[PDB]
Amino acid sequence: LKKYTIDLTERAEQGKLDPVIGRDEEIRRTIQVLQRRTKNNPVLIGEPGVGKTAIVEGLAQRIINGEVPEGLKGRRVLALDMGALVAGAKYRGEFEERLKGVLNDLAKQEGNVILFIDELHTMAGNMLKPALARGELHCVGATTLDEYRQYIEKDAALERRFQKVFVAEPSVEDTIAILRGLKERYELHHHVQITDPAIVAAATLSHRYIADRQLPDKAIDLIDEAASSIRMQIDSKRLLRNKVTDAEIAEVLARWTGIPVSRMMESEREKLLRMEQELHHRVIGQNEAVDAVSNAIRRSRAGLADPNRPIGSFLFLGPTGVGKTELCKALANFMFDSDEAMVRIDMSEFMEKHSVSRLVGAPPGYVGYEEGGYLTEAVRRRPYSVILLDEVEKAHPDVFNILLQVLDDGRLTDGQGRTVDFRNTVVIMTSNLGSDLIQERFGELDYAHMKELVLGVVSHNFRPEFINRIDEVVVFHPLGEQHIASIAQIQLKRLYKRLEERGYEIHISDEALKLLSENGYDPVYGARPLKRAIQQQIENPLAQQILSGELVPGKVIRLEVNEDRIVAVQ
Amino acid sequence: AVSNAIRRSRAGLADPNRPIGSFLFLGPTGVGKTELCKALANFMFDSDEAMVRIDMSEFMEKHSVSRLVGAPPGYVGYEEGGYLTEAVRRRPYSVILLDEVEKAHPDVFNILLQVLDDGRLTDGQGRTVDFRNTVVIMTSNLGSD
Numbered sequence: 001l002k003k004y005t006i007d008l009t010e011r012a013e014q015g016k017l018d019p020v021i022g023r024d025e026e027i028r029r030t031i032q033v034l035q036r037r038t039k040n041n042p043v044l045i046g047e048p049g050v051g052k053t054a055i056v057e058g059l060a061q062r063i064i065n066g067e068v069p070e071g072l073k074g075r076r077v078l079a080l081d082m083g084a085l086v087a088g089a090k091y092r093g094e095f096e097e098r099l100k101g102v103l104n105d106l107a108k109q110e111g112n113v114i115l116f117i118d119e120l121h122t123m124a125g126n127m128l129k130p131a132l133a134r135g136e137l138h139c140v141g142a143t144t145l146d147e148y149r150q151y152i153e154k155d156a157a158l159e160r161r162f163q164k165v166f167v168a169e170p171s172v173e174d175t176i177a178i179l180r181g182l183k184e185r186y187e188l189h190h191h192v193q194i195t196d197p198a199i200v201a202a203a204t205l206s207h208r209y210i211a212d213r214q215l216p217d218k219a220i221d222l223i224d225e226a227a228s229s230i231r232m233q234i235d236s237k238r239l240l241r242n243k244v245t246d247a248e249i250a251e252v253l254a255r256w257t258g259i260p261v262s263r264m265m266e267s268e269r270e271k272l273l274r275m276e277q278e279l280h281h282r283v284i285g286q287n288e289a290v291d292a293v294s295n296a297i298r299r300s301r302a303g304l305a306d307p308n309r310p311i312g313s314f315l316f317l318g319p320t321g322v323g324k325t326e327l328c329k330a331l332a333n334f335m336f337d338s339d340e341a342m343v344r345i346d347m348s349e350f351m352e353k354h355s356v357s358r359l360v361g362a363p364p365g366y367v368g369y370e371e372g373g374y375l376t377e378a379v380r381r382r383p384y385s386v387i388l389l390d391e392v393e394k395a396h397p398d399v400f401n402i403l404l405q406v407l408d409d410g411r412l413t414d415g416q417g418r419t420v421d422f423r424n425t426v427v428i429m430t431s432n433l434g435s436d437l438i439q440e441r442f443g444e445l446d447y448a449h450m451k452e453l454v455l456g457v458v459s460h461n462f463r464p465e466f467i468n469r470i471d472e473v474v475v476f477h478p479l480g481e482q483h484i485a486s487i488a489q490i491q492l493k494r495l496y497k498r499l500e501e502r503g504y505e506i507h508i509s510d511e512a513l514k515l516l517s518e519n520g521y522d523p524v525y526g527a528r529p530l531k532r533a534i535q536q537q538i539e540n541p542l543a544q545q546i547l548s549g550e551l552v553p554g555k556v557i558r559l560e561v562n563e564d565r566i567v568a569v570q
Numbered sequence: 571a572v573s574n575a576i577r578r579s580r581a582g583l584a585d586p587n588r589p590i591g592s593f594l595f596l597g598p599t600g601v602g603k604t605e606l607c608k609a610l611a612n613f614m615f616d617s618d619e620a621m622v623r624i625d626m627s628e629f630m631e632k633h634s635v636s637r638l639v640g641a642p643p644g645y646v647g648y649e650e651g652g653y654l655t656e657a658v659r660r661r662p663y664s665v666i667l668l669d670e671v672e673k674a675h676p677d678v679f680n681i682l683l684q685v686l687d688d689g690r691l692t693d694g695q696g697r698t699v700d701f702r703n704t705v706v707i708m709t710s711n712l713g714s715d
């Protein structure tokens with residue numbers, strides 16, 4: 001009744017509404033739907049964040065400013081609150097006398113009140129249905145595109161009374177103009193200086209890095225949060241910024257989606273040129289693999305990466321034991337500081353056609369639909385990741401197609417329908433396909449010979465549609481004598497750290513490191529023979545003296561050599 | 571010949587019982603099949619991503635059909651519609667890219683006959699959807715050799 005004078009036009013009269021910009025064809029349709037004699041009820045429908053509550057706040061800022069037609073001049077936009085009409089309506093028929101007491105004194109103005117039911121689908125609200133049809137209330141609803149479907153589309157006699165005046169998500173060029181007219185609201189709440197580089201590069205950066213939101217709600221937020229970060233650094237304890245710049249926008253996105261465009265200029269760019277030194281600390285050999293990996297991480301940090309495809313999509317073809325999933329563990333240890341920070345997926349677990357429903361999730365109406373699948377879910381959670389599709393050698397095209405879109409255009413949709421973007425991820429696919437051809441025919445193949453053998457899967461798979469998408473087919477060579485002599489003192493260095501925590505300190509001999517480098521050398525089995533020679537020649541002799549109290553903690557366990565048999569003595 | 575079906579019918583002067591264009595884009599790899607669906611969607615709607623791109627990701631299954639048309643009534647994903655059906659109810663004039671359509675199950679085409687001739691695909695909820703104004707492109711890789 002008169003507990004409801006909720007005047008959205010006096011909020012616009014007192015300057016308490018944000019200025020709306022450039023939706024002059026959805027307001028012009030909102031106006032002209034509101035000016036017809038039967039069911040003048042527009043419904044600003046559209047995705048969340050798009051700008052459809054802030055069209056009625058641009059009606060209210062045009063009605064109060066006289067940019068409307070002169071039959072709509074001097075109206076009143078009134079935001080009807082569903083919550084305030086149902087609150088306290090405990091007794092029977094209190095809500096109906098409350099709503100009729102609204103409908104009565106909407107009629108007393110004789111059509112000079114434009115009602116605004118924001119979040120229209122909340123209309124307890126059973127009885128407006130005849131008055132909405134005659135044009136007795138001018139009722140701008142503004143519900144989303146999925147909440148109109150599951151409430152108002154269910155009442156098929158109620159969605160007749162409403163004209164959807166669909167509010168499309170604006171472009172980047174329409175969001176920069178939206179943002180150039182809104183920054184004086186955020187330059188004045190935060191007392192900062194949002195510069196025009198921080199607006200062109202906040203509707204650009206959020207329009208590409210953000211996919212879970214709309215368009216006008218992402219760029220506007222970034223600037224809202226970069227300004228509240230600058231005001232934080234203005235206050236808390238020239239050199240300081242009074243000014244939101246385009247680098248401050250990227251810092252707000254770097255810690256919100258993974259990696260910025262601009263935080264690099266100090267010591268991260270030093271350790272990106274030191275990447276092949278940092279990756280060779282754990283993957284010795286395979287310069288052609290470490291260079292092809294580190295170039296793709298440099299191509300993205302320089303902003304040079306194709307923004308539609310992933311950062312890098314590699315196929316790691318080689319023999320066994322040569323470091324194909326050691327590179328992907330040394331890559332994720334480089335950029336995420338943990339080996340188990342890949343989205344690693346052993347491809348050998350899905351040998352069936354039904355096993356492709358665990359990477360994308362079950363379709364609507366099945367078990368495990370509501371849980372997604374752990375490729376698209378683990379990438380929707382953390383969008384900048386490394387995806388290890390380890391041991392990628394299956395005989396099913398249905399499970400391979402999934403990667404037809406991950407690697408080209410960088411998208412892959414849930415069973416739930418949510419499209420997950422892979423354009424910021426590094427997809428690595430380490431199979432074993434040139435194995436008996438890299439070993440024998442090594443030299444001047446230049447990935448043109450083992451790539452025929454990954455091409456020639458086409459009796460089953462590896463369709464040329466798929467190899468055309470992967471960015472680097474990578475040559476992994478077998479390990480030589482000098483390589484496994486240096487994977488020795490990696491796995492040896494990895495063993496003393498397993499013993500300092502026990503409290504035992506080991507010195508290695510210069511021949512004991514030469515025994516494992518000649519006993520654990522096998523050309524066909526890579527570096528796992530050395531990984532087994534250590535756990536057979538120097539760890540089983542250690543454990544019969546670590547258990548048996550023969551080796552006290554603290555004294556230096558000298559790994560001397562007996563008659564070609566490594567002995568642990570203190 | 572994709573700017574001839576949108577040229578026959580801008581206001582609509584094609585057959586008004588079948589879509590604006592139904593195209594199979596057959597070819598080798600890397601030739602521009604999916605790029606024509608992003609240069610046409612950029613021409614009509616001023617954005618490459620302004621088409622209904624259904625990759626045939628998980629379309630081989632024995633029921634992925636309910637992914638792009640919707641679950642049956644009373645099932646778990648029922649109230650969220652289907653991917654193809656809701657995107658054309660929401661905007662009837664779109665481009666629909668069906669990427670690598672041969673990599674889908676034959677049960678996918680058995681509901682995709684209804685959009686190609688009748689121009690109208692009923693869904694799992696049970697409402698009929700006008701595809702008579704959309705452009706349905708099916709890129710595929712058959713005949714590549």
Ligand SMILES: Nc1ncnc2c1ncn2[C@@H]1O[C@H](COP(=O)(O)OP(=O)(O)OP(O)(O)=S)[C@@H](O)[C@H]1O
Binds near residue numbers: 021022053055142182
């Ligand atoms: N054309 C515009 N001009 C100025 N600000 C805009 C414009 N469109 C959107 N905004 C701003 O975008 C933000 C969110 O938009 P809203 O319209 O309030 O929410 P919405 O789009 O209605 O989505 P909801 O959550 O379903 S109400 C607000 O800060 C608005 O001021």
Ligand SMILES: Nc1ncnc2c1ncn2[C@@H]1O[C@H](COP(=O)(O)OP(=O)(O)OP(O)(O)=S)[C@@H](O)[C@H]1O
Binds near residue numbers: 319321323325432531
């Ligand atoms: N080039 C290398 N540099 C350092 N360690 C290596 C190298 N190659 C193998 N290793 C070691 O051997 C193991 C790695 O084997 P993986 O590389 O995971 O198997 P793969 O080489 O990828 O081939 P597979 O059997 O087809 S998975 C780990 O213990 C690594 O420490």
Ligand SMILES: Nc1ncnc2c1ncn2[C@@H]1O[C@H](COP(=O)(O)OP(=O)(O)OP(O)(O)=S)[C@@H](O)[C@H]1O
Binds near residue numbers: 468603604
């Ligand atoms: N005719 C063309 N004109 C311009 N760019 C092209 C053309 N053909 C291919 N390209 C480029 O090649 C890339 C991949 O080609 P796409 O057309 O996307 O894939 P496709 O040609 O449809 O074939 P697939 O793998 O079977 S889906 C595109 O991103 C373009 O950059």
